[PDB]
Amino acid sequence: MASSLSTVASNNLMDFCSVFNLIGAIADISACRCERSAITNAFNKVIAQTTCIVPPWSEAQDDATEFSDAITKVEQWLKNVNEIEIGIRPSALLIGKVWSRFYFNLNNVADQHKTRLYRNAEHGRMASQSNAAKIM
Amino acid sequence: KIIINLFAPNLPGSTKEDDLIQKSLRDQLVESIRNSIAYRNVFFVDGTRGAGKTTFINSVVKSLNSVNIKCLPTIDPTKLPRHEPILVTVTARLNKMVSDKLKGYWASNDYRKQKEQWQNHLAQLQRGLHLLTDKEYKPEYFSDALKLDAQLDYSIGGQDLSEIFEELVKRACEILDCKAILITFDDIDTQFDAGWDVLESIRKFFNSRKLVVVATGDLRLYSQLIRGKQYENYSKTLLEQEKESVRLAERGYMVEHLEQQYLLKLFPVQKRIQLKTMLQLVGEKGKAGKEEIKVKTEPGMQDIDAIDVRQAIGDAVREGLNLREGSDADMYVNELLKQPVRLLMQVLQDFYTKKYHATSLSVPNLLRNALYGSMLSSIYRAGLNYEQHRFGMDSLCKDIFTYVKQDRDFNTGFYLRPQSESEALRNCSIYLASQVSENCQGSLSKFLQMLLVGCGSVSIFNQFVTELDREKFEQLISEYVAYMSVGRIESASHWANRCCAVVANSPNDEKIGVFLGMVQLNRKSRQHMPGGYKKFNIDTENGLAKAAMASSLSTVASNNLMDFCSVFNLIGAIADISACRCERSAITNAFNKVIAQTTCIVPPWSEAQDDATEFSDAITKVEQWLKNVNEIEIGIRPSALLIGKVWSRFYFNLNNVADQHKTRLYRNAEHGRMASQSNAAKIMRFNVLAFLHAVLVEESLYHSVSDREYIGEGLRLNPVTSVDEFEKKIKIIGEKLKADNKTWKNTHPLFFLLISCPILHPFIFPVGGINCSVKALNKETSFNKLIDEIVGDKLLSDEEWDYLTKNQQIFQNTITSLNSSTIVGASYDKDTPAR
Amino acid sequence: QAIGDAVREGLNLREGSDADMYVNELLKQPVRLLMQVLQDFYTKKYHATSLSVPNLLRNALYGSMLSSIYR
Numbered sequence A: 001m002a003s004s005l006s007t008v009a010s011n012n013l014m015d016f017c018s019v020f021n022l023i024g025a026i027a028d029i030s031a032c033r034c035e036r037s038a039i040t041n042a043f044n045k046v047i048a049q050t051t052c053i054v055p056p057w058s059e060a061q062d063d064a065t066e067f068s069d070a071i072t073k074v075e076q077w078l079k080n081v082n083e084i085e086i087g088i089r090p091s092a093l094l095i096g097k098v099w100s101r102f103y104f105n106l107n108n109v110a111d112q113h114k115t116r117l118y119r120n121a122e123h124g125r126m127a128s129q130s131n132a133a134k135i136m
Numbered sequence B: 001k002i003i004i005n006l007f008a009p010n011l012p013g014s015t016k017e018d019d020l021i022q023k024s025l026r027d028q029l030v031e032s033i034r035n036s037i038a039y040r041n042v043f044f045v046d047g048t049r050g051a052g053k054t055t056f057i058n059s060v061v062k063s064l065n066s067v068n069i070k071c072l073p074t075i076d077p078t079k080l081p082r083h084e085p086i087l088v089t090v091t092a093r094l095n096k097m098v099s100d101k102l103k104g105y106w107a108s109n110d111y112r113k114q115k116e117q118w119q120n121h122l123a124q125l126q127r128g129l130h131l132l133t134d135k136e137y138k139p140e141y142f143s144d145a146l147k148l149d150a151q152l153d154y155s156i157g158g159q160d161l162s163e164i165f166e167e168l169v170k171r172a173c174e175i176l177d178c179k180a181i182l183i184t185f186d187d188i189d190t191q192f193d194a195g196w197d198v199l200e201s202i203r204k205f206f207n208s209r210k211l212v213v214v215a216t217g218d219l220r221l222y223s224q225l226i227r228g229k230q231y232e233n234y235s236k237t238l239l240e241q242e243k244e245s246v247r248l249a250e251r252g253y254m255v256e257h258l259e260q261q262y263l264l265k266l267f268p269v270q271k272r273i274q275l276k277t278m279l280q281l282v283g284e285k286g287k288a289g290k291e292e293i294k295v296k297t298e299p300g301m302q303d304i305d306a307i308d309v310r311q312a313i314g315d316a317v318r319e320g321l322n323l324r325e326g327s328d329a330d331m332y333v334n335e336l337l338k339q340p341v342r343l344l345m346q347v348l349q350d351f352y353t354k355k356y357h358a359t360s361l362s363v364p365n366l367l368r369n370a371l372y373g374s375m376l377s378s379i380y381r382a383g384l385n386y387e388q389h390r391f392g393m394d395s396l397c398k399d400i401f402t403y404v405k406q407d408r409d410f411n412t413g414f415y416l417r418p419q420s421e422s423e424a425l426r427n428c429s430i431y432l433a434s435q436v437s438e439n440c441q442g443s444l445s446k447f448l449q450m451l452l453v454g455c456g457s458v459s460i461f462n463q464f465v466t467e468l469d470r471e472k473f474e475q476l477i478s479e480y481v482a483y484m485s486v487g488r489i490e491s492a493s494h495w496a497n498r499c500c501a502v503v504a505n506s507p508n509d510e511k512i513g514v515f516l517g518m519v520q521l522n523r524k525s526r527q528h529m530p531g532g533y534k535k536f537n538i539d540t541e542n543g544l545a546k547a548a549m550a551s552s553l554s555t556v557a558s559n560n561l562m563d564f565c566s567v568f569n570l571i572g573a574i575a576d577i578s579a580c581r582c583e584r585s586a587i588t589n590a591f592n593k594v595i596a597q598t599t600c601i602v603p604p605w606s607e608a609q610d611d612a613t614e615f616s617d618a619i620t621k622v623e624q625w626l627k628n629v630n631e632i633e634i635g636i637r638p639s640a641l642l643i644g645k646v647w648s649r650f651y652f653n654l655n656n657v658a659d660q661h662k663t664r665l666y667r668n669a670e671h672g673r674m675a676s677q678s679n680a681a682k683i684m685r686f687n688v689l690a691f692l693h694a695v696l697v698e699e700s701l702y703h704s705v706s707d708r709e710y711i712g713e714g715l716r717l718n719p720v721t722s723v724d725e726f727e728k729k730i731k732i733i734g735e736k737l738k739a740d741n742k743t744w745k746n747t748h749p750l751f752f753l754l755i756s757c758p759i760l761h762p763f764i765f766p767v768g769g770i771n772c773s774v775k776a777l778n779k780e781t782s783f784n785k786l787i788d789e790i791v792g793d794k795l796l797s798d799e800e801w802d803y804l805t806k807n808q809q810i811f812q813n814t815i816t817s818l819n820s821s822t823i824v825g826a827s828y829d830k831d832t833p834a835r
Numbered sequence C: 001q002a003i004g005d006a007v008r009e010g011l012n013l014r015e016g017s018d019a020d021m022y023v024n025e026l027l028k029q030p031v032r033l034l035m036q037v038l039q040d041f042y043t044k045k046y047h048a049t050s051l052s053v054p055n056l057l058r059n060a061l062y063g064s065m066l067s068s069i070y071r
């Protein structure tokens, strides 16, 4: 979530969590693939080095062992992926198409779960109750 | 193997058999023409501007010089007399080698007959040459076309110079006992208008089978030449009468559709070859090298120790910019490889020649001179300062402002990232980074000025003045640069004294008198104030507290004089005290440089012990600090990315503090001990910490004196409310440096010097800003001893620190009364909610 | 089938409308432009076989409709 946790620097500190930054996280891990630096620095790329301002056109315990533990999991991920990722071949059509599948899925999920919040929906077990975690 | 000698003219005439950068293409093309003639036939090499064309096209002729093909000397369309048919110069060149053949062989019976046959066609061609130059038809010449010659067969009547030249070359081949004649052209980059006659003649007269043509030029430039000649066919009246966009669209398509196929008639697609750029030959870091290149950096070296080309640029980029070894340094060398070979070689030739000459002493100084001449054209296009001896931080800070407006990016503009769209801005970005690391090198006072007035002047305009169609935005920059005087700054403190006025004219919700990095101490007394709150008074403090408080002040005249407490002034003041050590009283003047003659004005864009030795002890502490910095000023090697990265962290960290500690004033701010309590002095303690914490993260992350960082694998944040996370960063770094057996000076020169400045000492531990709780002390007590570890001697007396922990004694290095001061608009009404 | 082996693997397409449309859009091209892009394949791929097949197509296309890029 830390990578997805983006803070908009303005007159008020506004913070957002988005699925795109999850997409934008994995899409950059495989770029370097080595040196144990880009992958480690990927976990902190918006904390203080990305302060987006609203556009002018608008109207406005120890974490030491757990940090090195989490890094090797994506290092575990890369060596298993690299043994098959060459045999697959995409193209123009069937890569734009899946985005339309993805883009419309986001719209429907956001629209439906927008009004599915209640005072007792936190970790709600009802098929209709929803919270912030249910959106994600 | 390629060995490039940098101490060589590198001209096309001074090439060798091993110094050729491109050899596979030279060899590969040679057999292709031979196989074509073994059993139109117009070749075409395609070359990026500066790839290497005239040198390359000379090598292929050399290969064909030693089936048998005879090659004519290379002809340059640019270096030819104007108003001269190109059929003439080919015939004249052809005649020379044929006339050399006739007087060569020994037999006389054939020579007397062969010469007569050769001259029969020359006279035929000469009398028919008037068609190429005449502007109008002569009715007399009709009787000349009707007259048929003898002994020669012409399948087509008339003049028809196409067959006459075709018959001429056929007889020219018999005398030269060859299979075909090689005609080679040259590039027309210098004047591409002259290249129109080349294309016109090739498609008309060189249509035989024993002629092979090898053109050369820039393909993207030929298209603009042909398209211009297509429009000349349309009648000018039609081109004006029918201006409808519906007709204009189809007219433009027809022109494009015509010359697209026209170029295919001249140069077939399968015949076109390209010259690979400098990048496509060596290859990137990840992939293997196709054809490696080794260069001779120093003169008179053995061929064994020849350095690679990438290491020959990393020797300059990494060292000339003081940029640490990493992927970011690879950004520049990758961009430099994509540049044309002619530009890249001249940059490499000049830098290494001067470095050897200097050795027989500043590396960035030698690189800056090389970059100035190379991209002088892009400097003039962008309008940057270009006078040689007017260099300095005053000009450089103006230069970086011009670049940002051109790039239209206020977020990463001061990073100087070569990622712009226009080629001119990319050249300016790399050039500016060279100048940033030249003046800033080996100086602390120069470093802060670049950070404060150079980088800072862009961020302030982005958020507070830009929000005030682009034509109106244009004059705002014009008067803003005049107001704050980016072109010429009298003192770093005066910029901060002007920075506050710029940002003060931007109110906020509920009009709390706290701003980005500053608070507004009330200059008067409001009736019936609760608790011990009162009006701020400088005379309450003593010793270093008054001196530190004197620097951190600024006033603005806005029909009622407003007082300001600032962090920017403290940053600027240090950049002035650390300027020159040759005088003692200068630092005393720096203490009260602005406190007396401020008289600041609202910007146009906005409508509205003994007193003899009172500071004697303060001067000694500052004077001792002068010896410490002056012995370390050599070590510091700031880069063009370090300063940009430091400021960005500062901007986010400082923006958070000024926002969270805004509603946290609930009548119990005075004598604050719990983290929820927050008074005016609490904000100022954190802002100074926000400056030093921002330096700590980026100093280790990016610096030329450290190969690897010592922060370690771990998430980083900013101390908005809690100093605990800032405490562990120093503790962890202290552990790592101990294992490597390294000191503090030779690893973090910036952090060590700032933390030892006597001026910043009192603001770290104020009276009313220190957090005191059950767990607040736990982190703070280690933090207090951690700061003592960095400095050689003890920071403060133990008893003084004890009083701050619990809740009379005089404080020399601690502010005593800023905590109780009020804030304009901060009407103390609510109460602290506790649970 | 001589354009089928030119788009299906040149553009990484399977048997379908897109592969058949691209043959049609390579058929609406003038015969002069159809030869050169087609000739570039079998001439170059014979040298390769004595791969970068989709890149080999882009090599042929670059010299095929180069001028329309400027529009």
Ligand SMILES: Nc1ncnc2c1ncn2[C@@H]1O[C@H](COP(=O)(O)OP(=O)(O)OP(=O)(O)O)[C@@H](O)[C@H]1O
Pocket: B004, B010, B011, B012, B015, B019, B020, B021, B050, B051, B052, B053, B054, B055, B056, B186, B187, B188, B189, B190, B341, B342, B343, B345, B346
């Ligand atoms: N073998 C080589 N080694 C190093 N640099 C070379 C080599 N061959 C060419 N160069 C570089 O290319 C330059 C030659 O220019 P180039 O061959 O691109 O001709 P041009 O300027 O386009 O042609 P012209 O002047 O005939 O119109 C040299 O000055 C040098 O900078």
